[PDB]
Design a protein around this ligand. Structure first.
Ligand SMILES: *[C@@H]1O[C@H](CO)[C@@H](O)[C@H](O)[C@H]1NC(C)=O
Ligand SMILES: *[C@@H]1O[C@H](CO)[C@@H](O)[C@H](O)[C@H]1NC(C)=O
Ligand SMILES: *[C@@H]1O[C@H](CO)[C@@H](O)[C@H](O)[C@H]1NC(C)=O
Ligand SMILES: *[C@@H]1O[C@H](CO)[C@@H](O)[C@H](O)[C@H]1NC(C)=O
Ligand SMILES: *[C@@H]1O[C@H](CO)[C@@H](O)[C@H](O)[C@H]1NC(C)=O
Ligand SMILES: *[C@@H]1O[C@H](CO)[C@@H](O)[C@H](O)[C@H]1NC(C)=O
Ligand SMILES: *[C@@H]1O[C@H](CO)[C@@H](O)[C@H](O)[C@H]1NC(C)=O
Ligand SMILES: *[C@@H]1O[C@H](CO)[C@@H](O)[C@H](O)[C@H]1NC(C)=O
Ligand SMILES: *[C@@H]1O[C@H](CO)[C@@H](O)[C@H](O)[C@H]1NC(C)=O
Ligand SMILES: *[C@@H]1O[C@H](CO)[C@@H](O)[C@H](O)[C@H]1NC(C)=O
Ligand SMILES: [Fe+3]
Ligand SMILES: [Fe+3]
Ligand SMILES: [Zn+2]
Ligand SMILES: [Zn+2]
Lengths: 424, 424
C-alpha cells in the first residue's frame, strides 16, 4: 500500500539544483533557533539560508554545512544543515534556500517565550511511512481545525528499510512527501527501530546512519552527547526524547543524561512535562506485547517520581490510552507485580497508527486489562492542546472520521498544578 | 586499600623499551590462534612476535599493529596487538616479544581440539581491581591445586576510573600486576561498568575507550560487529560473552547477534554452554539489587529455551549461587511473577568478589529467598572444572581459607546430556 514513485506527492520541485526535501526543527533549548535542512541533487550548491522577519524586513544570511553518505550501492545527494540563531519569539519569518540557482521560500513562526500559562498545540504523529494511509493522516492533520503548531514524531519515519538494500530512494521520496508540513512547522524527532538499519549482509553496520545524516537535532543544547536522546523546551512544555534502541543500562550515557535532566526540569517554568519514546511501556495489543518491559524497569519510577504528565509512544500500529498507572513495587519475591492506579504516574498514550506501509495492529489482549482506558485499531493522528498551566486537552482523530471528529478526547489535569483525578 | 604505586607487583621490567603489560587471549573461534598484546614505553618498537613450538622448534614471526590513545592529560605508551594463527592444538609454544631492543619470552599451551568429552578447567575471576585483596585472589588462583587453564573474566578490570581524571596510569599498573597470569594463559574479557568511563567533564565521552585500546577480542570470529559481545569455543565449552552496558533492545546489534548465535550452538560438539555478563540477572544482595532486571526481561527465556548451563556474573562484590530457576511467565496482569524451580534454567552464579578496591558487599536481602542456593560475602575466585560431557564441578575458594579449601562445591549435570536434578 506504499504510494508509487510517481505519486504527485513525490514530485521533485522544478529548477536546476532546486532544494528538495526541505525540513525544519528546533535548533536550541528554548525556541529561538531553527535548524533548516534540505537536499540539492544536481550539484553541491550553497548552504546559506536567507531569512528575515515579516516586520523588520532586514534580510540576513546564515551559513550551514553540507554532507553526503553512501548506503550500499546508494549515494546521497548533497545534504545541507544550517542553523539560524537568535530569533525573536512569536514572529513569522521567511527563509529562502537554494540561493545559487533555484531559490525556494518558506516561513515559520517562532514560538512564545517559555511560560507557565503559554498555550500551544502539538500534533502527534508516529509511525508515518509512505502508504496512501499516511497521506491521509498527514492531510487530516493539516486540516485539524485546532491547527497544530509543532509535530511530536514518535519514530519510524519512512520504512525504507522494508525495501531491498533499504533502497534509500524511499528516504528521498518520504522527505519530499512530508515537506509540505515540515518545511513550515518543526517536527521533533524520535528514533524508532525502522531507523536503526543494521544491515550486516550489505555491510552497512553503523546504526541510524541514513536517519542521522538526514535528520539533525539540537542535542547539544540539553547537554546530551548523542542525537538519540535530548530535550527541548517550547512554550509551556518541557519535552524529553528517549531512544528505545540505544542503551539505558545503569551508568550508560543515556541513563546518566536522563537522570540529570529530570532534575533540571522546572515546573514553575514549564508546567507540562512530556516524554517521547518509540517502544511503549504500557501496551495491551499482541504485536510488540511487553517489549517496553526492559526500559520500563529502568525509567518508570523516575517518571512517577517526577510526575511526568504524558508519555507518547508509537511502534504498535494502533491507538491506546491508559489510566494513570504505576507498577513500581515489585521485588521479585513479594508478588507485587500488578499495575495499580497511581495519580502521580503519567498517562501512557500510543499513536503509532499514522499509516506505516498500510497495516494496522488489530489483535488485542482479550480482555482489555484494567490499566488500559481506551484502545482502538484505526489509523489517525493526535493533538495535545495546552490551554493553561492546569489544563491540556488531548484528542485522537480517526482517519475514517471527518477532519473535525474527535473519536477520543480527554482533559489532562497537570500532575504538578492541578493533580486531580483526570482518569475516566 | 589499593596497592601503592611502588608495590613490587607494579615494577617495570628492566631494559630499554622492554615489553610490559603482556597479555594474551583466544584469537579465533576454536582455539588455534592467540592475540598477543603488550606495551612499550620508550619508543614504538616492533609489533612482531617470534614464536615456535616446543617440539618443532621452527621459529616463526607474526606481525601485528601498534596504537596509542590520549585520555585527558594522559598519553598511552605504544600498544601492540599481534595475532598468531594456525597453531597446533594442545601444544606448548614459546613467544618472544620486544625483538628490537629488550626481548622477553613467554609460553602458552593451545587447548585440545573442541570435543564432546574434552575436559578443561576454567578459572572464574570477576571484579579484580588492584587492592591487596586482589593480589591475594590472584595468588590463590595461581596456587589452585586443580590448576586453571583460562580465566573467564567477568568485568571491572582495574578501577582506574575511581582515580581522578581516571588516572590511566592505574590501567598501566593493573596491566603489569596481572601479567604474571595473562602473559601465560588467556583471559576471556567481559566489559563492566568500570570500563565504560563516560567522563563528559573531562571531555572523554567515547564509552569503553581505554579498555578497548588495551584489551582486544576475536569478536569478528563469531560474526559480531562489536568487541563487546562475542563468543569462542574452547575444549568442550561454548562461551558467549554479553555487554550489560551496551544495548539489547529488540533489533539492536547485540540483540540480533545473540539470537542467531544461540542457534549456532551445537551441543553434540560443545556440550557445555556458558554465558558471561557483568550485571547479574539473579542477585539477593542489597547492592545493585534488581539492576539485571532489564536484561533479564530480554534474555532469560532464550537461556531457558537453549538450556544454557551456567551464567557467571560479577558486579556484586560477594558470592552467590542459585537454584536452576526461571521466572518467565509474567504477563503483567496474570500475577505469575515469582521464580519457580526450572530444570532447564541455568544456575546463575556471581563471583564479583575478587577484590576490587578492597571492599565487600555484605548487606543481603534478609531472608535468603528461595531461588538463592548459597551466598557469602567473602573475597575469592571460582573454578569450573569440566570433566565429562555430563559432569563439570564448580568450586569457590575463599581468600581466608587455604589454597585448597573449597568453601563451596557443586557438581553440574549437563542440561543437555544428563539433565538430572543437580540442585541442592
Ligand atoms: C542496487 O543493486 C540492485 C541489485 O543488487 C539493483 O537492481 C539496483 O538497481 C541497484 N541500484 C543502484 C543505484 O545501483
Ligand atoms: C547556476 O548558478 C551559477 C551562478 O549563479 C550560474 O553561472 C550557472 O550557469 C547557473 N545554472 C546552472 C545550470 O548551473
Ligand atoms: C495526497 O493528499 C493530497 C491532499 O491532502 C492530494 O492532493 C494528493 O493527490 C494525495 N496523493 C495521494 C497519492 O494520495
Ligand atoms: C560484505 O558482504 C558480506 C556480509 O557481511 C561478507 O561476506 C563480506 O566480508 C562483507 N564485507 C566486505 C568488506 O566485503
Ligand atoms: C484552563 O482552561 C479551562 C478550559 O479551557 C478553563 O475552564 C479553566 O478555567 C482554565 N483555567 C484557568 C486558571 O484559567
Ligand atoms: C593531570 O592534571 C592533574 C590536575 O588536573 C595533575 O595534578 C596531574 O599531575 C596531571 N597529569 C599529567 C600527566 O599532566
Ligand atoms: C635499540 O635497538 C637498535 C637496533 O637494534 C639499536 O641501534 C639501538 O642503539 C638500541 N638501543 C637503544 C637504547 O635504542
Ligand atoms: C603479591 O603476592 C605475591 C605472591 O603471590 C607476593 O610475592 C607479593 O609481594 C605480593 N605483593 C603485594 C603488594 O601484596
Ligand atoms: C570540556 O570541558 C567541559 C565539559 O564538557 C566543557 O565546558 C567544554 O566545552 C568541554 N569541551 C571542550 C571542547 O572544551
Ligand atoms: C564423569 O565424571 C564423573 C566424576 O569425575 C564420573 O563419576 C562419571 O562416571 C563420568 N562419566 C563418564 C561418562 O565417564
Ligand atoms: Fe512502526
Ligand atoms: Fe565492581
Ligand atoms: Zn517500530
Ligand atoms: Zn560493576
Amino acid at each position: 500500500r506504499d504510494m508509487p514513485l510517481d505519486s504527485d506527492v513525490f514530485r521533485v520541485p522544478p529548477g536546476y539544483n532546486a532544494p528538495q526535501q526541505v525540513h525544519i526543527t528546533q535548533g536550541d533549548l528554548v525556541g529561538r533557533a531553527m535548524i533548516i535542512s534540505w537536499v540539492t541533487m544536481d550539484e553541491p550548491g550553497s548552504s546559506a539560508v536567507r531569512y528575515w522577519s515579516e516586520k523588520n524586513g532586514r534580510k540576513r544570511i546564515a551559513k550551514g554545512k553540507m554532507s553526503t553518505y553512501r548506503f550500499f550501492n546508494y549515494s546521497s545527494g548533497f545534504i545541507h544543515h544550517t542553523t539560524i540563531r537568535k530569533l525573536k519569539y512569536n514572529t513569522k519569518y521567511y527563509y529562502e534556500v537554494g540561493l545559487r540557482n533555484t531559490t525556494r521560500r518558506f516561513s515559520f513562526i517562532t514560538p512564545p517565550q517559555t511560560g507557565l500559562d503559554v498555550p500551544y498545540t502539538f500534533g502527534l504523529i508516529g509511525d508515518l511511512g509512505q502508504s496512501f494511509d499516511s497521506n491521509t493522516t498527514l492531510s487530516h492533520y493539516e486540516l485539524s481545525p485546532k491547527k497544530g503548531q509543532t509535530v511530536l514524531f514518535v519514530g519510524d519515519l519512512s520504512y525504507a528499510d522494508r525495501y531491498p538494500n533499504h533502497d534509500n530512494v524511499r528516504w528521498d521520496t518520504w522527505g519530499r512527501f512530508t515537506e509540505r508540513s515540515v518545511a513550515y512547522q518543526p517536527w521533533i524527532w524520535t528514533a524508532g527501530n525502522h531507523e536503526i538499519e543494521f544491515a550486516p549482509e550489505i555491510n552497512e553496520t553503523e546504526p541510524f546512519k541514513p536517519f542521522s545524516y538526514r535528520y539533525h537535532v539540537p542535542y547539544e543544547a540539553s547537554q546530551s552527547t548523542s542525537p538519540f536522546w535530548y530535550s527541548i523546551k517550547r512554550a509551556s512544555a518541557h519535552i524529553i526524547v528517549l531512544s528505545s534502541y540505544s542503551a539505558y543500562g545503569r551508568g550508560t550515557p543515556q541513563y546518566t543524561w536522563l537522570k540529570k535532566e529530570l532534575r533540571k526540569v522546572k515546573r514553575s517554568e514549564t508546567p507540562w512535562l512530556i516524554v517521547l519514546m518509540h517502544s511503549p511501556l504500557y501496551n495491551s495489543y499482541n504485536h510488540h506485547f511487553m517489549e517496553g518491559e526492559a526500559m520500563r524497569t529502568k525509567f518508570e519510577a523516575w517518571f512517577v517520581k517526577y510526575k511526568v504528565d504524558v508519555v507518547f509512544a508509537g511502534h504498535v500500529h494502533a491507538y491506546e490510552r491508559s489510566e494513570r498507572v504505576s507498577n513500581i513495587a515489585y521485588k521479585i519475591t513479594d508478588g507485587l507485580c500488578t499495575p495499580v492506579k497511581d495519580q502521580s504516574a503519567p498517562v501512557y498514550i500510543t499513536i503509532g497508527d499514522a499509516g506505516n506501509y498500510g497495516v494496522i495492529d488489530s489483535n488485542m489482549i482479550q480482555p482489555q486489562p484494567e490499566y488500559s482506558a481506551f484502545r482502538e485499531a484505526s489509523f489517525g493522528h493526535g493533538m495535545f492542546d495546552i490551554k493553561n498551566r492546569t489544563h491540556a486537552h488531548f484528542s485522537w482523530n480517526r482517519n475514517q472520521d471527518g477532519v473535525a471528529v474527535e473519536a477520543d478526547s480527554v482533559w489532562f489535569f497537570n500532575r504538578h498544578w492541578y493533580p486531580v483525578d483526570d482518569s475516566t
